[PDB]
Ligand binder design. Structure first.
Ligand SMILES: *[C@@H]1O[C@H](CO)[C@@H](O[C@@H]2O[C@H](CO)[C@@H](O[C@@H]3O[C@H](CO)[C@@H](O[C@H]4O[C@H](CO[C@H]5O[C@H](CO)[C@@H](O)[C@H](O)[C@@H]5O)[C@@H](O)[C@H](O)[C@@H]4O)[C@H](O[C@H]4O[C@H](CO)[C@@H](O)[C@H](O)[C@@H]4O)[C@@H]3O)[C@H](O)[C@H]2NC(C)=O)[C@H](O)[C@H]1NC(C)=O
Ligand SMILES: *[C@@H]1O[C@H](CO)[C@@H](O[C@@H]2O[C@H](CO)[C@@H](O[C@@H]3O[C@H](CO)[C@@H](O)[C@H](O)[C@H]3NC(C)=O)[C@H](O)[C@H]2NC(C)=O)[C@H](O)[C@H]1NC(C)=O
Ligand SMILES: *[C@@H]1O[C@H](CO)[C@@H](O[C@@H]2O[C@H](CO)[C@@H](O)[C@H](O)[C@H]2NC(C)=O)[C@H](O)[C@H]1NC(C)=O
Ligand SMILES: *[C@@H]1O[C@H](CO)[C@@H](O[C@@H]2O[C@H](CO)[C@@H](O)[C@H](O)[C@H]2NC(C)=O)[C@H](O)[C@H]1NC(C)=O
Ligand code: NAG
Ligand code: NAG
Ligand code: NAG
Ligand code: NAG
Ligand code: NAG
Ligand code: CA
Ligand code: CA
Ligand code: CA
Ligand code: CA
Ligand code: CA
Ligand code: MN
Lengths: 151, 534, 345
């Protein structure tokens, strides 16, 4: 019923690897606010926002630590999740509605999330000549917002 | 230096089938007839739908040199589902590596493209066929549940195999863990007892193999060449593997333990990309009862007087001592672009002088690239630098791909029961397998007594030999002054005393007619003794 | 007759046991015509280097305009052998190796000659855009075979006898060695002849990778200067290969991967400033000893020769030919030769 939209992330080399070139400890996905405003202008019109990720074939143990960018100088904790030991590219969904709503009206240069431990669009896991190749379904921000005319 | 070059045993095979890629001897203990094993990976078989599958032909040594192939798996491709080929045996290169124990024959296909249970891709894992008597079994070490090139997808088993004296089989697959390598050693009894054609993983109970290394260790080609030898003196042969791609492409040799894969020693090449460890053999050379390590580098570049680099090849010999330290001696090549050191195979005590002998061959040397084989003897301190015998190929190039005579050879196995280990040389370019027989070696001592020196001339001599030899021998001598010459046909028995006589500088020639045996082997004189005194 | 090397030919007769030295003068010139070839890897590990190479075309001409007066540029690509286990022979992956990623990528190929050396540059910017990316499974990428095919096949590439040949090969990781093809099953060596049917190396599945020594000899015979533009950690590995390859130098590429024009300028300047000579002697009984003299005054005989030399700086090479058919002695990268004829008696 509600209109859906997708907000693609920045390129791994363009803006992701600007200062955080080697984020081995945690994979980082960055975004800028112009595309979020393009998806929907009204902050209140965002009924729900979701984060889509593609799981890998770990099948041993998955513990993801979710930090967020508060004023680009600190960290913010929201929640944590686990991945079932299944050898299949399962889809992951995170509830980041508040962060997206806050960032939509907050002017900034770049914003992102830390995924630490204590995937499609990144290194697949085959070391050598088949490691750095990118494919579709690159991590994006799924949005579910009502049209301005309807509401 | 006793190899017969005037009458070599020549074996033919299918045309354009790489007949001679892998040669080995077959000496069954139960029977008194010793056969031969040759490889032909590109030989068409009678299997349905299999093109150029390959076979291991077995040739007899008798006068009627007729040859026939051995039946190992006479069936088509297996099926996993309806209209689904479970196997891709076409171009499987079956018979690339052949190793034979007393009565066990192991033929291995390194291009056995087994589709996985779930991913069902044509990645070749590599299997082997072990036969001892009428019963035959199938051995698949690299076929397991760790699929894709991460663990064992491109394991390529059976590339290099060897048999341990302790009734054990060593298998090395260079393609495991993104071409890192593996060394899978299993007991023959377990494989023989547990043979279920229904199950494919065929997981074993006493299977020990090297685990995955670090990420930087990728492209190591471990298990490229395997050998067996005793180093720590515990009664079990250790494992030696050639590593020509590790150490940022420098060349290494890894020595493991047959008990629980413990790293005893290591080796490192001096030149970058010099193919250190391409072929490794473990045999004794100085008769100290310690198994030495022989390492050959086919593509080695050396600096000349003017600094011009030439690719002649280099072979390194390691002399093991009681303490454990290794003394490395480098043997440079003889001809440019000859690939000296491509194939190394021990010959044992070829001339029965106590010290064993080894052979190093250059498959692309000589005129028109006919292949050159060098025979090296053994000393107390290493081995003799200069070659003792030269073997040359008598066949030219049929096509652009050269014959490459001497690309692979087997030895250290007596066939004619003369006590001399004969050597077989197989060239896949011309599809021939040539066996060279060791001629009898007779050591002779000569002594001349003249008194007074200012007259009586009375020369004496004796003869001795090892193995089966004719009871009576014929020798021709001569006389020189300052009649000036006196010839005499004398007869000396083996082990006899001083055959002294007088006549009122000598040169002696052995008669090659009466001394020849029924087969046709003419005894050869010792090359290390002088033929003239004073 | 000869221009760079002063003596066209020297005929000296000598009895065995007596030495007879001569003079070999070398005078490098200025404004060498440049034929530069781009042997670039189009493997999957270079999704960014291909786009980095896009802008070299028009920009490098400005830099080369005041070193040389005429510039001719070509193009080339190579991935790897079209065999297993180097590539995937699966029915769905034999033609496209990016099916598992659902990506449109060029099928792997041993060597394809996209464009020859042309005065036109607009052809170069058209050629860089129409070629896609490729890839395969194993980490090493066969480049020595591409070098040998781009060197031997002079007619297809279009090398000029009067210009300074330049073959600039770009890689980031190690290349396949000669005997690595035993895993695939190819077990006899490369002959080294021309096998380009139609700008495609058809003999990529029946012959092994060329030897390092054979490749170096062919490069010396074809008077080909090689620049090893690399960006990864393998810069040290390719730097240690420079003594093995006469007349060859290697350069570094940053991660941001835009110093290609500067790297080419520096490589050209270094190649012009180095003068090394080796003798390819086949006459039996003669021994070659070379004594090089440097303009700086430091007597440095040997293969290294003299470095940091420019025009109007005459470099001397004292050679004393003795005795214990003709022998050709020539500098590496110089289009002229100094063939010496000796009286056999
Ligand atoms: C002759 O040459 C031989 C070849 O060079 C050489 O053999 C090498 O020996 C060294 C040490 O003797 C050995 O290095 C060790 O390798 C161990 C794995 O076999 C490793 O164990 C840890 O790593 C395993 C897998 O590594 C992955 O996972 C790790 C996390 O677990 C991660 O950190 C790694 O980066 C990699 O991704 C893992 O499964 C295992 O559980 C261990 O975690 C050893 O690690 C030690 O170091 C860590 C610190 O990093 C310490 O916590 C601890 O002390 C660990 O023990 C160690 O790296 C090579 O692997 C051998 N190579 C081959 C090939 O076998 C012989 O030793 C030489 N002989 C002589 C006499 O010199
Ligand atoms: C190796 O390279 C050298 C440098 O490029 C060549 O040397 C020069 O070769 C030019 C050939 O293109 C000459 O130009 C021509 O020379 C002839 C003299 O025979 C004149 O009639 C032509 O008019 C002239 N063409 C022009 C100027 O456009 C150069 O004169 C000559 N020398 C210099 C100093 O540039 C070598 O020839 C070349 N060697 C081989 C074997 O190709
Ligand atoms: C093995 O059998 C095949 C066909 O029965 C022979 O022909 C080869 O296979 C196809 C035939 O259509 C061709 O594409 C190949 O080029 C053929 N090979 C050659 C070398 O011509 C093949 O010759 C047979 N091989 C042997 C050793 O007998
Ligand atoms: C099994 O492996 C272990 C560990 O590699 C071996 O224990 C070492 O063996 C070496 C070889 O003699 C000794 O020098 C060490 O003192 C041993 N202990 C260590 C390293 O802590 C063991 O010998 C191997 N074999 C068996 C049967 O256990
Ligand atoms: C920033 O936002 C713009 C909006 O048009 C978008 O095109 C771009 O991809 C974003 N990321 C950048 C510039 O890194
Ligand atoms: C010795 O034997 C040879 C060959 O058997 C024979 O030709 C010769 O006449 C014999 N006698 C002498 C004196 O050589
Ligand atoms: C090649 O250069 C010439 C010289 O100006 C030019 O006229 C021509 O258009 C160029 N070729 C192309 C395809 O643009
Ligand atoms: C050749 O000449 C050099 C320089 O004059 C000198 O080292 C010696 O006379 C000779 N060297 C060799 C290695 O023959
Ligand atoms: C070259 O060296 C020789 C010594 O080997 C010397 O006699 C001769 O004078 C030298 N020639 C020149 C031009 O210096
Ligand atoms: Ca032992
Ligand atoms: Ca010894
Ligand atoms: Ca001996
Ligand atoms: Ca014999
Ligand atoms: Ca590759
Ligand atoms: Mn690559």
């Amino acid at each position: 019923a509600k209109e859906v939209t997708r907000v693609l992330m920045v390129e791994t080399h363009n803006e992701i690897y600007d200062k955080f070139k080697q984020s081995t400890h945690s994979i980082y996905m960055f975004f800028n606010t112009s595309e979020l405003r393009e998806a929907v202008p009204e902050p209140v019109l965002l009924s729900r926002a979701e984060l889509r990720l593609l799981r890998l074939k770990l099948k041993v143990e998955q513990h993801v630590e979710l930090y967020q960018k508060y004023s680009n100088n600190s960290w913010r904790y929201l929640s944590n999740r686990l991945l079932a030991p299944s050898d299949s590219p399962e889809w992951l969904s995170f509830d980041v509605t508040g962060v997206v709503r806050q960032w939509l009206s907050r002017g900034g240069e770049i914003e992102g999330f830390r995924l630490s431990a204590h995937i499609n669009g990144f290194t697949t896991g085959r070391r050598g000549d088949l490691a750095t190749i990118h494919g579709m379904n690159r991590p994006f921000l799924l949005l579910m917002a009502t049209p301005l005319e309807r509401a | 230096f006793n190899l017969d070059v005037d009458s070599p045993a020549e074996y033919s095979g299918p045309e354009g089938s790489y007949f001679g890629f892998a040669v080995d001897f077959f000496v069954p203990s139960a029977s008194s007839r010793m056969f031969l094993l040759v490889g032909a990976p590109k030989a068409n078989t009678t299997q349905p739908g299999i093109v150029e599958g390959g076979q291991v032909l077995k040739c007899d040594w008798s006068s009627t040199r007729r040859c026939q192939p051995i039946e190992f798996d006479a069936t088509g491709n297996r099926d996993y589902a309806k209209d689904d080929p479970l196997e891709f045996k076409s171009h499987q290169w079956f018979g690339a590596s052949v190793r034979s124990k007393q009565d066990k024959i192991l033929a291995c296909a390194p291009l056995y493209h087994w589709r996985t249970e779930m991913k069902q891709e044509r990645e070749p894992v590599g299997t082997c066929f072990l036969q001892d008597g009428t019963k035959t079994v199938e051995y698949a070490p690299c076929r397991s549940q760790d699929i894709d090139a991460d663990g064992q997808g491109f394991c390529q088993g059976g590339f290099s195999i060897d048999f341990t004296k302790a009734d054990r089989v060593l298998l090395g697959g260079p393609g495991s863990f993104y071409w890192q390598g593996q060394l899978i050693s299993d007991q023959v009894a377990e494989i023989v007892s547990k043979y279920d054609p229904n199950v494919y993983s065929i997981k074993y109970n006493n299977q020990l193999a090297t685990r995955t290394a670090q990420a930087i260790f990728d492209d190591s080609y471990l298990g490229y060449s395997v050998a067996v030898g005793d180093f720590n003196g515990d009664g079990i042969d250790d494992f030696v593997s050639g590593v020509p791609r590790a150490a940022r492409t420098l060349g290494m040799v890894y020595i493991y333990d047959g008990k629980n894969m413990s790293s005893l020693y290591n080796f490192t090449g001096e030149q970058m990309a010099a193919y250190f460890g391409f072929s490794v053999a473990a045999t004794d050379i100085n008769g100290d009862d310690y198994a030495d390590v022989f390492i050959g580098a086919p593509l080695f570049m050396d600096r000349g007087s003017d600094g011009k680099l030439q690719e002649v090849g280099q072979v390194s010999v390691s002399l093991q001592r009681a303490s454990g330290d290794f003394q490395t001696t480098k043997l440079n090549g003889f001809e440019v672009f000859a690939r000296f050191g491509s194939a190394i195979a021990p010959l044992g005590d070829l001339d029965q002088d106590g010290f064993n002998d080894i052979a190093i061959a250059a498959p692309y040397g000589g005129e028109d690239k006919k292949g050159i084989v060098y025979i090296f003897n053994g000393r107390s301190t290493g081995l003799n630098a200069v070659p003792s015998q030269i073997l040359e190929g008598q066949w030219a190039a049929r096509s652009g791909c050269p014959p490459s005579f001497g690309y692979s050879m087997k030895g250290a196995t007596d066939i004619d029961k003369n006590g001399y280990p004969d050597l077989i040389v197989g060239a896949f370019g011309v599809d021939r397998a040539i066996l060279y027989r060791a001629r009898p070696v007779i050591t002779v001592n000569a002594g001349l007594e003249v008194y007074p020196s200012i007259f009586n001339v009375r020369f004496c001599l004796k003869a001795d030999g090892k193995g089966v030899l004719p009871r009576k021998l014929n020798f021709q001598v001569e006389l020189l002054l300052d009649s000036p010459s006196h010839s005499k046909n004398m007869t000396i028995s083996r082990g006899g005393l001083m055959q002294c006589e007088e006549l009122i500088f000598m040169e002696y020639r052995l008669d090659y007619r009466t001394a020849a045996d029924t087969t046709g082997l003419q005894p050869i004189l010792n090359q290390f003794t002088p033929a003239n005194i004073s | 007759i000869n221009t760079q090397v002063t003596p066209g030919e020297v005929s000296i007769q000598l009895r065995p046991g007596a030495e007879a030295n001569f003079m070999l003068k070398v005078h490098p010139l200025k404004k060498y015509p440049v034929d530069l070839y781009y042997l670039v890897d189009v493997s999957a590990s270079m999704h960014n280097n291909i786009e980095k190479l896009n802008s070299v075309g028009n920009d490098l001409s400005r830099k080369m305009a005041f070193f040389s007066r005429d510039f001719r540029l070509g193009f080339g690509s190579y991935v790897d052998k079209t065999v297993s286990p180097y590539i995937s022979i699966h029915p769905e992956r034999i033609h496209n190796q990016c099916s598992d990623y659902n990506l449109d990528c060029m099928p792997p190929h041993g060597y394809i000659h996209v464009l020859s050396l042309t005065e036109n540059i607009t052809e170069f910017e058209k050629a860089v855009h129409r070629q896609k990316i490729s890839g395969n499974i194993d980490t090493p990428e066969g480049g020595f075979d591409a070098m040998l095919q781009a060197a031997v096949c002079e007619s297809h590439i279009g090398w000029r006898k009067e210009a300074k040949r330049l073959l600039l090969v770009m890689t980031d990781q190690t290349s396949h060695l000669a005997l690595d093809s035993k895993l695939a099953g190819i077990v006899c060596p490369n002959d080294g002849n021309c096998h380009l049917k139609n700008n495609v190396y058809v003999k990529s599945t029946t012959m092994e990778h060329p030897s390092l020594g054979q490749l170096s000899e062919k490069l010396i015979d074809n008077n080909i200067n090689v620049i090893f533009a690399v960006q990864g950690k393998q810069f040290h590995w390719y730097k240690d290969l420079l003594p093995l390859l006469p007349g060859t130098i290697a350069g570094e590429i940053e991660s941001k991967a835009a110093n290609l024009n500067n790297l080419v300028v520096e490589a050209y300047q270094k190649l012009i400033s180095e003068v090394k000579v080796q003798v390819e002697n086949q006459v039996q009984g003669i021994y070659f000893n070379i004594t090089a003299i440097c303009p700086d005054g430091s007597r440095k005989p040997g293969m290294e020769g003299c470095r940091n030399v420019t025009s109007n700086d005459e470099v001397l090479f004292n050679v004393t030919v003795t005795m214990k058919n003709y022998a050709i002695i020539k500098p590496i990268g110089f289009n002229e030769t100094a063939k010496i004829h000796i009286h056999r008696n």
